Amino acid sequence: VHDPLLAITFELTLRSCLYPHIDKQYLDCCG
Amino acid sequence: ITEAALVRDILYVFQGIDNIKMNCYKVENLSRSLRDTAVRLSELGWLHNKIRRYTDQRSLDRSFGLVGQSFCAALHQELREYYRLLSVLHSQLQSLTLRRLLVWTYDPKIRLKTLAALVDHCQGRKGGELASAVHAYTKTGDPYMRSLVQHILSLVSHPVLSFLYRWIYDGELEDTYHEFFVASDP
């Protein structure tokens, strides 16, 4: 999932778009 | 002391590097019919050492200004040309003689006589006052000089027309060195 994100300001803000993959997944588990 | 040795040293006196030593280049034997033409031919070096030193001494301090530097820079494109001709002449020394050299270096004894007398008429001129003292050499009429100096003027007067096109359309004059004829008061 991280690799396709590279297809669609480097490694600091760019890395800040990886967490939506790891956070929504978390929200389901705790929920 | 053959004739091939003098041509060996003369090709170096044309630059400043010294039989022929250093105001005339007194040569120190050989026949009189040789010393005279050497003294005459070497006169091109004394015109070359003086012009090179002027560009160098001024290329050291930044006090000359933008207009001055431009004129000093214009004295190098008219020296690369003088540094190329020597290379072609150098390749033939391996035949040319003093008589052959005279018909070779008869023209660059004139360009090295306007430039070596253009840097003395404008000695202490810093700023536009320099671009006004290399324009007082165009009223000459000589079609070979008036078409040389009227080219150095086209380079020296480029920075002047850079402030003018700035102080007219934008009104923002900027010259740490006082060159433009519009002086501001803080």
Partner: protein
């Protein structure tokens, strides 16, 4: 000896062209095979080699710190590119006809001989005054208003890439609220403003 020289002008000193840590590149002494009058033009030619060596040694050393110093050296190699490329050519011309002397080789440098000298003190002012931060974007600019056309066209390139850093940081701040900095470079440090480091123009 030609290919020997074209390496000495590249940054590799040898027996014919000794290297001294203080003075710079220079010819050792008189050589019997060559003429005794050339011993001068080479010394005039080495005044250029010393510049490239002292350039590339500083470029590699990166020395002081800060991105604006990193990018300055990053750009400093770009202006220095035509020097190298024009040096590779000299070998090709000598490979064709074997009748070319040092005179022609000295003549070929022409433009580099009147450029390096003016772009040498710009480096010296940095290493001798600890010019830290964005203050470089003025120290290089105050020398960009020089008369020499070649120089006026060289430093402008360096200022054109050095601005790329500010333009990177400036856009990163004006739309993302954060300032990417860890050495107090950009002129902003409840935030405030900086004046003692702000550019001139």
């Amino acid at each position: 000896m030609i290919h020997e020289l074209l390496l000495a002008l590249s940054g590799y000193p040898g027996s014919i062209f000794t290297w001294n840590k203080r003075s710079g590149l220079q010819v050792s002494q008189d050589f019997p095979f060559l003429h005794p009058s050339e011993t001068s033009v080479l010394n005039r030619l080495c005044r250029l080699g010393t510049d490239y060596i002292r350039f590339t040694e500083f470029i590699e050393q990166y020395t002081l710190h800060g991105i604006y110093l990193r990018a300055f050296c990053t750009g400093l190699d770009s202006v220095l590119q035509p020097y190298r490329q024009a040096l590779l050519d000299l070998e090709q011309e000598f490979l064709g006809d074997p009748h070319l002397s040092i005179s022609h080789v000295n003549y070929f440098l022409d433009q580099f001989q009147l450029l390096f000298p003016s772009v040498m003190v710009v480096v010296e002012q940095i290493k001798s005054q600890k010019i830290h931060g964005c203050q470089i974007l003025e120290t290089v600019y105050k020398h960009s208003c020089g008369g020499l056309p070649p120089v006026r066209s060289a430093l402008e390139k360096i200022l054109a890439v050095c601005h790329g850093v500010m333009y990177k940081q400036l856009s990163a701040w004006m739309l993302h609220g954060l300032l990417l900095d860890q050495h107090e470079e950009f002129f902003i440090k409840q935030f405030s403003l900086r004046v003692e480091i702000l550019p001139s123009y």
